[PDB]
Coordinates of C-alpha atoms in Angstrom, one line a residue:
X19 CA 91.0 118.9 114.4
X20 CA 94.1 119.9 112.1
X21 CA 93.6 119.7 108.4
X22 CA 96.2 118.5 105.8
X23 CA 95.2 120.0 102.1
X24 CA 91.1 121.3 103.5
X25 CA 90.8 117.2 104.5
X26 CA 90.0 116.6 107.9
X27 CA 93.1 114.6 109.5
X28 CA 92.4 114.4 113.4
X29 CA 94.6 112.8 115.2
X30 CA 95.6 115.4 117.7
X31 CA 96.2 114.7 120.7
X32 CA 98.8 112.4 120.7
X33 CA 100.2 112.7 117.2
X34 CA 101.4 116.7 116.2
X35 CA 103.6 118.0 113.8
X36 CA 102.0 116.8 110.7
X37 CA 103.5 116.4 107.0
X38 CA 101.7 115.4 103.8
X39 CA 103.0 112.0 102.1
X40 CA 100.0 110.8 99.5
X41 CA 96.8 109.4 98.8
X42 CA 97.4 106.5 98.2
X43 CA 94.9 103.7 96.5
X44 CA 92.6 105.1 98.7
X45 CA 92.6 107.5 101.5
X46 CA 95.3 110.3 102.8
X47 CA 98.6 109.6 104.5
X48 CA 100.9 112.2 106.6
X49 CA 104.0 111.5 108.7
X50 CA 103.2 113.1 112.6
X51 CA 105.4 113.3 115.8
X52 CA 104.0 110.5 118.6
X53 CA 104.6 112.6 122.2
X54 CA 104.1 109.3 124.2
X55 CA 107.3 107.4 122.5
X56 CA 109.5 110.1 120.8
X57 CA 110.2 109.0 117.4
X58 CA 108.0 110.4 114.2
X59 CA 105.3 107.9 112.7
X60 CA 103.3 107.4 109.7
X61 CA 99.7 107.5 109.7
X62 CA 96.5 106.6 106.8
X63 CA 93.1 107.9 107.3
X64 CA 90.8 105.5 105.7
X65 CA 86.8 106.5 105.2
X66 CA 85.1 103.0 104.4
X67 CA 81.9 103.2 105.8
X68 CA 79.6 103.8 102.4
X69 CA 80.9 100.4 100.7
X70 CA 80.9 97.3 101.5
X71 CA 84.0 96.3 99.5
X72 CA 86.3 99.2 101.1
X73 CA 85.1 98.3 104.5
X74 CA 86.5 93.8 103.6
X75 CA 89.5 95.3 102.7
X76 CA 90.2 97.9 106.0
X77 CA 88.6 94.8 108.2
X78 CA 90.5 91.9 106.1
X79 CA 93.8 94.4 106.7
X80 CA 93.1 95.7 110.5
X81 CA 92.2 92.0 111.7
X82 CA 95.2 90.6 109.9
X83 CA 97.8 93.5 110.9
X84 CA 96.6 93.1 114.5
X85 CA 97.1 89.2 114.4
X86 CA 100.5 89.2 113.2
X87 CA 103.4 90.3 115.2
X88 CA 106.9 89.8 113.2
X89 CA 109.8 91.9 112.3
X90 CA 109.2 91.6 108.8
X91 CA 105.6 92.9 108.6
X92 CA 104.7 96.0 109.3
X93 CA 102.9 96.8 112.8
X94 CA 99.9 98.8 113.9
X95 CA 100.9 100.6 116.4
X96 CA 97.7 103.0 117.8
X97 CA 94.2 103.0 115.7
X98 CA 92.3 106.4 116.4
X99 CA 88.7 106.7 115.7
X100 CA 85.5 107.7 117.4
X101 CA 84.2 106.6 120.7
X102 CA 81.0 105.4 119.0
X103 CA 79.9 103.3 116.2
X104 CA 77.6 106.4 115.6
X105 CA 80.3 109.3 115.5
X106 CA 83.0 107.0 113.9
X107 CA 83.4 108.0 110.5
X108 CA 87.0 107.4 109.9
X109 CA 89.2 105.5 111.1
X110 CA 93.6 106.4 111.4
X111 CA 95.9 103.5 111.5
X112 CA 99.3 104.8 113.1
X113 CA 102.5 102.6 111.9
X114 CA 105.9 102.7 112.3
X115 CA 107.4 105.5 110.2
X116 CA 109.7 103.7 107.5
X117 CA 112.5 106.3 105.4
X118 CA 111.1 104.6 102.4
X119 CA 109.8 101.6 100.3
X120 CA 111.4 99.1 97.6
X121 CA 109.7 100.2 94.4
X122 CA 111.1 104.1 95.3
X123 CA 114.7 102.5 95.9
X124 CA 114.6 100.9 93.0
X125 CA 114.1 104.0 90.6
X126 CA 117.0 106.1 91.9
X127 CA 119.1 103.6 93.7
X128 CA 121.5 100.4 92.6
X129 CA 121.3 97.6 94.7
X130 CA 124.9 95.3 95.8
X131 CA 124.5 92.0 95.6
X132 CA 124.6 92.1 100.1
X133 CA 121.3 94.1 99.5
X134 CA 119.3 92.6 97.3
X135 CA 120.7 89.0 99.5
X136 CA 119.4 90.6 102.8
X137 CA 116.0 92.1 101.3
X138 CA 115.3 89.0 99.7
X139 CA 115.9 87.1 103.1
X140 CA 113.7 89.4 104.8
X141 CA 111.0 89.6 102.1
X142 CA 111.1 85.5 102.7
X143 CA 111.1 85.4 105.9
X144 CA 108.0 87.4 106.7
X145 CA 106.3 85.5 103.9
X146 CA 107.4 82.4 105.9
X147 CA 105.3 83.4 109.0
X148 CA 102.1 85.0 106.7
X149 CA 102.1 81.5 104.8
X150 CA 102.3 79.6 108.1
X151 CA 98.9 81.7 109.5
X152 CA 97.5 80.0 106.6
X153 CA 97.2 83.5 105.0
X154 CA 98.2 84.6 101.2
X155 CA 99.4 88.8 100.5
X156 CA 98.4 88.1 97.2
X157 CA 99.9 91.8 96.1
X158 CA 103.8 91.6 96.8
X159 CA 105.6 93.9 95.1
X160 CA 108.0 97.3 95.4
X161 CA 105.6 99.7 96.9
X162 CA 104.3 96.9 99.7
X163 CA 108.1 96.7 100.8
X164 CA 108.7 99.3 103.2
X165 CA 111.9 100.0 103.9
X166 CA 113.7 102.1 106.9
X167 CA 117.5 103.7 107.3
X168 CA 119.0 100.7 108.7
X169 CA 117.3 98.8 105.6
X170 CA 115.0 96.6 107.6
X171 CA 112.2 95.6 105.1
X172 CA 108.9 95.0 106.5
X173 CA 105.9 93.9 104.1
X174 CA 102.7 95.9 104.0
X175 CA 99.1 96.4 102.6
X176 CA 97.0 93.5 103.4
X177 CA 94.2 95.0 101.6
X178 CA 94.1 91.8 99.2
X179 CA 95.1 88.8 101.4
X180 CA 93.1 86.2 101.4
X181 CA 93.2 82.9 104.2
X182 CA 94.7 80.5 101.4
X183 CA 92.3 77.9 100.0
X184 CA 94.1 75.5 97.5
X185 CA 90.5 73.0 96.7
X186 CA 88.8 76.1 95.7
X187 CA 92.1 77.1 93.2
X188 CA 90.3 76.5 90.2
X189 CA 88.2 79.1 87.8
X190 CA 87.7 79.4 84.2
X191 CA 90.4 81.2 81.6
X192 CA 90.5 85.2 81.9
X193 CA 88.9 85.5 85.0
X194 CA 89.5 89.1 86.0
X195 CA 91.8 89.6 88.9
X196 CA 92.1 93.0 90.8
X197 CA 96.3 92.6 92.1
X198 CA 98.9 94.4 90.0
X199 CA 99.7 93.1 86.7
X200 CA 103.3 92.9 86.8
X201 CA 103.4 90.4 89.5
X202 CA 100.5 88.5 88.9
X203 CA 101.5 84.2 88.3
X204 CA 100.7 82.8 85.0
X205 CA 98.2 80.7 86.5
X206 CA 95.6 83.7 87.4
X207 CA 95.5 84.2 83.6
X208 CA 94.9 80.7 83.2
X209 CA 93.1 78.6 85.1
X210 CA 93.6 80.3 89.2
X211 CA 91.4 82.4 91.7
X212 CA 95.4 82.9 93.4
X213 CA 93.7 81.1 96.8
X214 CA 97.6 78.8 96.9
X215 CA 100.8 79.9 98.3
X216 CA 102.5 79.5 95.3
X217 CA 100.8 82.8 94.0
X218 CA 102.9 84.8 96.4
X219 CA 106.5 83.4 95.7
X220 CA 106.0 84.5 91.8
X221 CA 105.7 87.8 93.1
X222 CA 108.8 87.4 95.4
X223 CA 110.7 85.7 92.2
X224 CA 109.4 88.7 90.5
X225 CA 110.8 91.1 92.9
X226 CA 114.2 89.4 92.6
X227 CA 114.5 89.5 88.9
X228 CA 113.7 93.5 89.4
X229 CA 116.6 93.9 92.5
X230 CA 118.8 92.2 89.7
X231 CA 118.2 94.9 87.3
X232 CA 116.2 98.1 88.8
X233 CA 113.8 97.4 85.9
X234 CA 110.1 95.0 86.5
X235 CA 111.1 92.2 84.5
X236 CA 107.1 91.4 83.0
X237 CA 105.7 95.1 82.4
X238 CA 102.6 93.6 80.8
X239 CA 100.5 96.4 79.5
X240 CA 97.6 94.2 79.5
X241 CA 95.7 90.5 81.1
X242 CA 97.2 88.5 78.1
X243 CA 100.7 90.3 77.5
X244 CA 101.4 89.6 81.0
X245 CA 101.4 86.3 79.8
X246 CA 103.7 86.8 76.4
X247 CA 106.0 88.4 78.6
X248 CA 106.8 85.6 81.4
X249 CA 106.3 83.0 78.4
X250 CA 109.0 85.5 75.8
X251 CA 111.9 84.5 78.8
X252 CA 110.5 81.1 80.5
X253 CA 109.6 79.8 76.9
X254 CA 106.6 78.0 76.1
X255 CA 105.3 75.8 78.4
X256 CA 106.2 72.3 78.5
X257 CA 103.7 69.3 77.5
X258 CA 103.7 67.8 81.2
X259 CA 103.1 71.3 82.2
X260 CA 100.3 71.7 79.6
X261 CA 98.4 68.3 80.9
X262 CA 98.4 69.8 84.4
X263 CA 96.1 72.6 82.7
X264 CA 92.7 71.0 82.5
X265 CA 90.4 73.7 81.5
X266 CA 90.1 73.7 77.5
X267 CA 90.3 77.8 76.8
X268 CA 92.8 78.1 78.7
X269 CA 95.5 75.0 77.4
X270 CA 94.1 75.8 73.7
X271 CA 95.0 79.6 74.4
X272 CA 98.7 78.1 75.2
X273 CA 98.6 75.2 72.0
X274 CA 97.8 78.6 69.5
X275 CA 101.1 80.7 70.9
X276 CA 104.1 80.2 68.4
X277 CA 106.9 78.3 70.2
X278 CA 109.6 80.8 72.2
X279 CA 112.4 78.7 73.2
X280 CA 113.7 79.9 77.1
X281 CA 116.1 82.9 77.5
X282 CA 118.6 81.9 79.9
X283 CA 119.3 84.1 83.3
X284 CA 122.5 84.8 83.4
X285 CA 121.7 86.7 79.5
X286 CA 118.8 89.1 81.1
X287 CA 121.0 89.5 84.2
X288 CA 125.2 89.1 83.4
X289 CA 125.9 90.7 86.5
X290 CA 124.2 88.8 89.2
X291 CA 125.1 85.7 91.5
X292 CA 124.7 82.3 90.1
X293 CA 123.2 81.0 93.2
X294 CA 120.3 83.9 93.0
X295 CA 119.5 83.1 89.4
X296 CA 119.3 79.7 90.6
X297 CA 116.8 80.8 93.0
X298 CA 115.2 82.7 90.7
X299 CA 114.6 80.1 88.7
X300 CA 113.0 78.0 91.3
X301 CA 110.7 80.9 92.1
X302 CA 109.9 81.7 88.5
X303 CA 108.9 78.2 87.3
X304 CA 105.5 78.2 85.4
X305 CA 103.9 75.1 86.8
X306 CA 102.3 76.3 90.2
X307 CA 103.1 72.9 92.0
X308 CA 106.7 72.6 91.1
X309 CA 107.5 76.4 92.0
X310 CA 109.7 76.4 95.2
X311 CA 108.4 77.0 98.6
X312 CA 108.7 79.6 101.2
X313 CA 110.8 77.3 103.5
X314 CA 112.4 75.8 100.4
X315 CA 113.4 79.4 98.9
X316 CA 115.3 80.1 102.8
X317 CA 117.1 77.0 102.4
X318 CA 118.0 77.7 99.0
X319 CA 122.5 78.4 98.8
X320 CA 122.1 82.2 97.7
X321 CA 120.5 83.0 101.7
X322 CA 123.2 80.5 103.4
X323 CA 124.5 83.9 105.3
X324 CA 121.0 84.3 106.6
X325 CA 119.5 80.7 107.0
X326 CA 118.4 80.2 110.4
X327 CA 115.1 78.3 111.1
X328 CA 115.3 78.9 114.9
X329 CA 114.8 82.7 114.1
X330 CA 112.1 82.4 111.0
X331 CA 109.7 82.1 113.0
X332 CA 105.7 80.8 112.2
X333 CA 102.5 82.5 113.1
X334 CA 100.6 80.8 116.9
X335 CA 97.3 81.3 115.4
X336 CA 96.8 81.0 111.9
X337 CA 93.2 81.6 110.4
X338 CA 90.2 80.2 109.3
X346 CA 77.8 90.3 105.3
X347 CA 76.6 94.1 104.7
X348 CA 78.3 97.2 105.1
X349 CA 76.8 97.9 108.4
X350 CA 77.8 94.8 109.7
X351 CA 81.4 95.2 109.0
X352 CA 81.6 98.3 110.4
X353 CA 80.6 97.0 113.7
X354 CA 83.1 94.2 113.0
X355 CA 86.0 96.9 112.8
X356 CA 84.8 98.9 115.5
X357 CA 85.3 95.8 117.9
X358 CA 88.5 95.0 116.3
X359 CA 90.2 98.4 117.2
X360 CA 88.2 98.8 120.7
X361 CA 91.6 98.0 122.1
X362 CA 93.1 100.9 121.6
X363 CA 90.6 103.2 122.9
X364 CA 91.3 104.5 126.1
X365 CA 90.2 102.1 129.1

């Protein structure tokens, strides 16, 4: 078994030539050489066994990842573990090996208006067909864009997703939300659980307002300045807007805010498109319900170049309890790759 840093990583046979990358959230990652097709891949070793909510998460992710095939999401290729449920005590997922991912090109890199076109097509495209398995990310953003040298943009870490669930929306005001602040929708600090598709294209409006800039346009440095940010450019929320807000906390939270009046794009952003601001816009609108939609956001005049239906394809099948239990749930789900 070769180590990386005194950690166990085995993954020989098939998979030599190891190199360190991170660790991650959770768990170690090395790049490897794959001796049965000859091109260098990536591969995390995840140990979730012990808790219940890191073995969802490797189980919501492998079952997902396995479901979906579509050039703009990442792929597993090969899962290695242990013959038994018994002797299984990790578990390495091998994917594609990508030069690099969105939030690093970002910090050393300025993007042409051609690339931030085609990586917001791509980025919206494999939304299209996660959206249309009835499935929400739920944590887009730089780091889960992965990126190779050809720039084809695949979307990663389905660690969060959730199968979407619009009736069940609704929760109470500050209800604590584990995805990354800087892309999290108003509405989570409002009134949402983030169980509706809209939740996802703030994120992807988000991630366009940073390609325009190299900078995250909301760095919130905490639950209720996320929400002085977005509200410091969009302005105060409108009354119509404010009436679609039910609970009482959180519209009275809004009613105490002094009025900000709306900074206009093309101010935070002189150098970009009109047509992308006017997507941007569309995906940056506060109300969840008028916020454009994936198919809408495709069809939008900034991604004319692109727009194809015929080749944004949707998912066949779209979806849809202790520790011990899920572990036997992923060691079913990855019995495919075991040799037989």
């Amino acid at each position: 078994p070769e180590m990386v840093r005194g950690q166990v990583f085995d993954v020989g046979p098939r998979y030599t030539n190891l190199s360190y990358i991170g660790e991650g959230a959770y768990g170690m990652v090395c790049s490897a050489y794959d001796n049965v097709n000859k091109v260098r891949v990536a591969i995390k070793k995840i140990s979730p066994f012990e808790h219940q909510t890191y073995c969802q998460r490797t189980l919501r992710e492998i079952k997902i990842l396995l479901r979906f095939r579509h050039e703009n999401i990442i792929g597993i290729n090969d899962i290695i573990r242990a013959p038994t449920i018994e002797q299984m005590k990790d578990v390495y997922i091998v994917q594609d090996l990508m030069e690099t991912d969105l939030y690093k090109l970002l910090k050393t890199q300025h993007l042409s208006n051609d690339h931030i076109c085609y990586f917001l097509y791509q980025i919206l495209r494999g939304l299209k067909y996660i959206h249309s398995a009835n499935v929400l990310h739920r944590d887009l953003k730089p780091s889960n864009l992965l990126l190779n040298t050809t720039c084809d943009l695949k979307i990663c870490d389905f660690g969060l997703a959730r199968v979407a669930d619009p009736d069940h929306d609704h929760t109470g005001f500050l209800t604590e939300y584990v995805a990354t602040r800087w892309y999290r929708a108003p509405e989570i600090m409002l009134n949402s659980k983030g169980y509706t598709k809209s939740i996802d294209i703030w994120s992807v409006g988000c991630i366009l307002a940073e390609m325009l800039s190299n900078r995250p346009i909301f760095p919130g440095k905490h639950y209720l300045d996320q929400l002085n940010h977005i509200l410091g450019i969009l302005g105060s929320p409108s009354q119509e807007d404010l009436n679609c807000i039910i609970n009482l906390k959180a519209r009275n939270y809004l009613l105490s805010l002094p009025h900000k009046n709306k900074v206009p794009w093309n101010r935070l952003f002189p150098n970009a498109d009109s047509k992308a601001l006017d997507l941007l816009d569309k995906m940056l609108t506060f109300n969840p319900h008028k916020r454009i939609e994936v198919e809408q956001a495709l069809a939008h005049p900034y991604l004319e170049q692109y727009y194809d239906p015929s080749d944004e394809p949707i998912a066949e099948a779209p979806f849809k309890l202790p520790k011990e239990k899920l572990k036997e749930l992923i060691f079913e789900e990855t019995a495919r790759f075991q040799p037989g």
